[PDB]
Design a protein around this ligand. Structure first.
Ligand SMILES: Nc1ncnc2c1ncn2[C@@H]1O[C@H](COP(=O)(O)OP(=O)(O)OP(=O)(O)O)[C@@H](O)[C@H]1O
Ligand SMILES: Nc1ncnc2c1ncn2[C@@H]1O[C@H](COP(=O)(O)OP(=O)(O)O)[C@@H](O)[C@H]1O
Lengths: 91, 546, 91, 454
């Protein structure tokens, strides 16, 4: 889901003043703070997502690790099958 | 409305049809309940004229009349049985008592007589007696009045069933086969020693004893007796005997709802038939279910195969609750969030019409409490023969065979398309529509041919009428002659001339079809290619008939 | 009634000139460029003299190769990841 | 298939436990990692077979064998086994191949194919792999999840198996037959109690429970994340393969097992007779005699209904309710009628058209049931119920203890021949052979589409 009220922040849109940072959101020049961080979490990957955010927001795949497989079971083997040199390397 | 107006005690009369389904009017002498009249106009005489005062509320005398009508039915039954027992012909009796009493008395008397005949194996004499009774009822039916003619035909249904039974058992050779068939068919018994008059009569079939109820039915159309109908009755009573509800399934046009309706009919019950999944809300379903479980009546869920999932789940939960209540037998059931009593006589039946895939099945929670029974094609030949017999005939056997063969051949030959239907409904419609035509025409097969033409022919495509007339020529050899067209054709011609319309044999044929088939049908559907004079057609027919 | 103007995705000239304009701030680093005699045939820009042209060309090359690999055939999507990539580069 | 779903976590957990299962000495073959991989195959097959029915069990077994062998062996072996599997699917039949004195397995397979022992030819795949097939106890004890789905069909159940497993170890079973809203809240309060108590529980026919389980049980299972630390309860839900689809999160969270233990015909007669007779007799010797006869008839019909399309044109499910109705009808007719052979014909017709013919809707199947009923019920003087057992009439002194003793003895001493499917059931051996043919075709075909998928 997505509504063009966080649009002024998903895309950089702030009418900065001389010493104050303002953004036109809805009907109020809502105050902002430097520590404000927003992150969008998605439920499923199959569901189509709006194109505008894909242009703007930075997609990162934390999805379930169906692909590859080699890396996970490889890690399991190294931690399990004669692990001493493998984790001694990390040591 | 009835409570707030419980002073005229006559406005309720037009409500009580909904809450009995068998009677719609109540007789008043000056302020007393003289009797009731059923939907077909049959008048019931109540022995005890219920005196009414302005203080007694409506429901109090409603309660008293519930038992009063059943007591009057039992008394009329007793009088009819007494009059039949001492060697009296049925014809003088048909005009005295109600249809229920005469039917049940005839059933009991026939049961006893065939019992003694089976003990003696001299069925020829009884067969001859039954045949003379059939012929006498037939010739009496012609000159009788319609109000009683309904009674004659309704009883002739059961007498034809009895005659067929007697003949087929007489053809059977071994005593064991006779016992087999006799236990196969329904058998009637009464207990005079028991003081309880209401339960003094009961039905026995397949060795299972079911107590008859003297509830009034009026004169609903009698469903003729067929083997498959007997298997349906047997499986229904077998399911009921262990307190399991019945369940019928199969293709549409099999009369499953009509089968259970006839079961309640001959057993003396008004089976509340709820057609389902049309527009109806769950709340009224709960109300009627509570009513039937509190009164002891029987319900059938017509077209139960289709329902929305949530309402289906709710009604399944309720029906599982009530069925399990019958199983355990606890007096009270906590359904509809309220403690309600449960009459032991309450029972439920379900019908399943075919789905998109075909076989439609109950929710699995009901599998442990119901018995699904497939329903096959009814013996259309037998029912056609019986109907032709009851309407008076010359060659009813081969004529019925010809009609059934012609209908099947029509179904096989003509092109298949959505509105085409040649099921049992069409044959029943032909046999119920021919009667005025029979009065106008003769009774010969050509009258049946004309009925076929007036019913099925005007709903076909051009190639389909080609095939229809080809097969009509192939099977039947009676073509007929035009009649009573010396006036209607003239009226149509005058209407066309005054409307500036060019009369054509195509147009004339369509107009004749419409005029003939509008006499019976009430609401009409007109289908044809865009702008093909259908508006003009009904203008011409309407002003010509004006 | 409306006039329709097909803009479409940017072409090689656009990426070259635009990325040149941005990397005007940082076209050069410590010491000098790695040997600037790479193949000129695939150079959509002017001849390489600083890192500038090699960087813009490698970025555009990766961009269209990733687009032609992730999908097949016509790609009706403009480079948006390019802008984030170049911002990350400069920062 | 809806039930055959799987999760990444299950595969990784099985992979992790492959190694620390240093239980049985692996075959002394090439290196250590190769035998570790082969043990990986054995472990994943043993774990994941229990979630698959017999047909899918077999196809996955042989496909997995091929996956191992194609990679581990030469081109000649690969093409030879490909020719073998092509021969199995006669729609892709070819010429057999021979490798001299090298691969004894392939000669055995070709022998099984030629000798028309197609079922043995299939089962060879599992037999050669030296697998360790499991039961309910092994999977329940070894797995750590508290939830288990008791998958089966509508004609066989593992309820007695679960009960005897409990009685064998720690008991604690609480059978909860779900039903009405009163049954519903009793069930939910019982499971709430059992969460802390940790006793075993079993729910019947989750399909009819669909609304409650979607609303309550699914939400309860979702919420029971940290509640698994409580006393070790066992969650057992009986689901039917042909029933309604179960919610994906619920089936994914739980562990899965399917029942295939179909008892023998003699075993069916055994347990049906015992469960019917332990309630006590009602009337004379003829009552228990006809009870025995109808029990045998029920065994035969339950046997025949498992073959589709050989025998019945379509599959049916005969619940015990038919058995109770048959018993009630026989008891009633015997009470009504005198102690004679009089009511045999009417009883046969009633059974074939109402008690058991009511469900059926094909005149061919009606005729089959009618002829079977005429064979089993009609007759006297030592009826040959099966070609190996002779059942004589009760004698003239009418003692029922001797009758029950003789019936039990004649059931026990007589043994079931292997060809009972074709001998006890009046079916031509051609019919069962072509049934095996069709089974082989369908399984083998599915195996090709799988292998060309890889
Ligand atoms: N008997 C007739 N003689 C001469 N002309 C006729 C006759 N019947 C119909 N028409 C002509 O054919 C046309 C009738 O088409 P009309 O639209 O009335 O048919 P419809 O199928 O009933 O209607 P619609 O498809 O528009 O609902 C008119 O042009 C009318 O003049
Ligand atoms: N034995 C019979 N004799 C005469 N008519 C019958 C018989 N059985 C069914 N019919 C007719 O066939 C029609 C089919 O009814 P149907 O639509 O099958 O009922 P349902 O609602 O159970 O499907 C009924 O209207 C009935 O009049």
């Amino acid at each position: 889901f997505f509504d063009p009220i966080i649009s002024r922040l998903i895309s950089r849109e702030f009418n900065h003043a001389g010493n104050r940072v303002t953004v036109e959101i809805g009907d109020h020049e809502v105050d902002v703070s430097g520590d404000f961080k927003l992150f969008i979490h998605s439920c499923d990957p199959s569901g189509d997502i709006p194109i505008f955010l894909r242009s703007r927001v930075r997609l990162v795949h934390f999805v379930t690790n169906k692909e590859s497989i080699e890396t996970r079971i490889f890690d399991i083997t190294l931690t399990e099958e004669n692990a001493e040199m493998q984790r001694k390397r990390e040591d | 409305k009835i409570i707030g107006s419980g002073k005229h005690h006559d406005q309720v009369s037009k409500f009580m049809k909904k809450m009995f389904g068998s009677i719609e009017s109540i007789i008043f002498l000056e302020d007393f309940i003289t009797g009731v009249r059923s939907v077909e106009g049959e008048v019931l005489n109540l022995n005890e004229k219920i005196e009414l005062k302005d203080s007694i509320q409506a429901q109090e005398w409603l309660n008293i009349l519930d038992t009063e009508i059943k007591l009057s039915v039992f008394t009329q039954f007793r009088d009819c049985l007494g009059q039949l027992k001492d060697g009296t012909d049925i014809e003088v009796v048909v005009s005295k008592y109600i249809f229920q009493a005469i039917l049940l008395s005839a059933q009991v008397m026939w049961t006893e007589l065939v019992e003694k005949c089976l003990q003696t194996n001299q069925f020829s004499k009884y067969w001859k007696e039954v045949d003379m009774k059939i012929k006498g009822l037939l010739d009496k039916l012609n000159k009788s009045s319609d109000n009683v003619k309904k009674k004659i035909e309704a009883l002739l249904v059961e007498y034809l069933h009895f005659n067929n039974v007697i003949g087929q058992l007489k053809n059977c050779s071994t005593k064991e086969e006779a016992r087999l068939l006799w236990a196969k068919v329904q058998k009637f018994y009464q207990k005079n020693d028991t003081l309880d008059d209401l339960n003094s009569v009961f039905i026995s079939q397949s060795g299972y004893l079911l107590q008859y109820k003297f509830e009034y039915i009026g004169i609903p159309e009698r469903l003729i007796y067929t083997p498959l109908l007997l298997i349906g009755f047997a499986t229904l009573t077998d399911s009921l005997h262990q307190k399991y509800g019945g369940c019928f399934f199969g293709p549409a046009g099999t009369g499953k709802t009509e089968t259970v309706k006839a079961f309640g009919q001959n057993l003396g019950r008004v089976v509340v038939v709820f057609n389902c999944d049309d527009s109806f809300d769950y709340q009224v379903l709960s109300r009627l279910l509570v009513g039937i479980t509190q009164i002891g009546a029987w319900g059938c869920f017509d077209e139960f195969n289709r329902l929305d999932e949530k309402v289906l789940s709710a009604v399944s939960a309720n029906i599982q609750q009530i069925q399990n209540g019958l199983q355990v037998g606890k007096s009270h059931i906590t359904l509809l969030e309220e403690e309600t009593p449960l009459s032991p006589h309450t029972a439920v039946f379900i019908t399943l019409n075919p789905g998109y895939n075909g076989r439609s099945e109950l929710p699995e929670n009901l599998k442990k409490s119901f018995r699904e029974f497939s329903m096959k094609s009814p013996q259309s030949g037998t029912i056609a023969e019986m109907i032709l017999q009851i309407m008076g005939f010359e060659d009813s056997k081969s004529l019925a065979s010809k009609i059934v063969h012609f209908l099947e051949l029509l179904s096989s030959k003509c092109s298949s398309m959505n509105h085409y239907h040649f099921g049992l409904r069409t044959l029943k419609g032909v046999l119920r529509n021919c009667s005025p035509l029979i009065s106008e025409f003769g009774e010969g097969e050509k009258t049946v041919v004309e009925s076929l033409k007036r019913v099925i022919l005007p709903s076909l495509g051009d190639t389909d009428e080609l095939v229809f007339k080809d097969e009509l020529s192939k099977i039947f050899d009676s073509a007929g002659t035009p009649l009573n067209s010396k006036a209607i054709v003239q009226c149509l011609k005058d209407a066309g001339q005054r409307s500036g319309f060019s009369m054509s044999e195509e147009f004339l044929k369509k107009c004749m079809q419409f005029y003939y088939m509008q006499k019976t049908q009430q609401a009409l559907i007109l289908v044809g290619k865009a702008g093909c004079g259908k508006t003009a057609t009904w203008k011409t027919v309407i002003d010509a008939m004006a | 009634r409306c006039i329709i103007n097909w803009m479409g995705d940017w072409d090689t000239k656009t990426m070259s000139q635009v990325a040149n304009n941005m990397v005007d701030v940082i076209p050069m680093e410590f010491t000098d460029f790695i040997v600037p005699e790479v193949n000129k045939e695939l150079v959509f820009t002017e001849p390489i003299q600083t890192i500038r042209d090699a960087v813009v060309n490698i970025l555009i090359h990766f961009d269209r190769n990733f687009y032609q690999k992730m999908k097949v055939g016509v790609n009706p999507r403009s480079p948006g990841y390019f802008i984030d990539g170049l911002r990350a580069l400069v920062k | 298939h809806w039930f055959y779903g799987i999760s990444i976590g299950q595969f990784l957990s099985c992979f992790k436990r492959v190694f620390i299962k240093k239980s049985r000495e692996t075959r002394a073959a090439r290196t250590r990692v190769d035998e570790i991989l082969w043990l990986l195959y054995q472990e994943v097959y043993c774990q994941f077979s229990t979630a698959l029915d017999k047909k899918f069990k077999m196809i996955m077994a042989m496909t997995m064998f091929c996956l191992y062998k194609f990679d581990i062996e030469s081109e000649q072996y690969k093409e030879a086994v490909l020719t073998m599997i092509g021969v199995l699917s006669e729609s892709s039949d070819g010429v057999p191949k021979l490798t001299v004195d090298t691969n004894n397995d392939l000669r055995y397979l070709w022998d099984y194919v030629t000798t028309k022992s197609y079922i043995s030819a299939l089962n060879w795949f599992k037999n050669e792999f030296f697998v360790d097939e499991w039961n309910i106890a092994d999977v329940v004890a070894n797995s750590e999840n508290n939830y288990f789905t008791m998958a089966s069909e509508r004609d066989v159940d593992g309820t007695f198996k679960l009960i005897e497993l409990a009685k064998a170890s720690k008991e604690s079973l609480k059978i909860i037959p779900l039903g009405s809203i009163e049954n519903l809240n009793y069930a939910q309060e019982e499971i709430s109690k059992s969460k802390i108590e940790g006793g075993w529980i079993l729910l019947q026919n989750i399909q009819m429970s669909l609304s409650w389980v979607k609303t309550y049980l699914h939400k309860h299972v979702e919420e029971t994340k940290a509640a698994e630390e409580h006393e070790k309860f066992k969650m057992f839900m009986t689901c039917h393969l042909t029933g309604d689809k179960l919610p994906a999160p619920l089936l994914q969270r739980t562990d899965r097992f399917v029942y295939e233990d179909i008892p023998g015909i003699l075993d069916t007669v055994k347990d049906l007779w015992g469960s019917q007779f332990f309630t006590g007799k009602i009337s004379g010797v003829w009552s228990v005699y006809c009870t025995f006869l109808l029990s045998w008839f029920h065994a035969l019909i339950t046997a025949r209904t498992r073959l589709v399309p050989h025998g019945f044109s379509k599959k049916y499910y005969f619940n015990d309710c038919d058995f109770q109705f048959a018993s009630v009808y026989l008891e009633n007719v015997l009470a009504t009628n005198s102690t004679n052979n009089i009511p045999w014909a009417q009883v046969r017709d009633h059974i074939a058209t109402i008690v058991y013919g009511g469900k059926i809707d094909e005149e061919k199947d009606l005729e089959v049931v009618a002829k079977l009923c005429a064979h089993v019920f009609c007759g006297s003087d030592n009826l040959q119920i099966v070609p190996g057992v002779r059942i004589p009439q009760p004698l003239l002194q009418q003692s029922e203890e001797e009758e029950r003793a003789r019936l039990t003895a004649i059931l026990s001493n007589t043994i079931e021949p292997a060809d009972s499917l074709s001998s006890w059931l009046q079916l031509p051996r051609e019919s069962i052979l072509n049934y095996e043919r069709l089974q082989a075709k369908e399984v083998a075909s599915s195996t090709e589409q799988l292998l060309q998928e890889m």
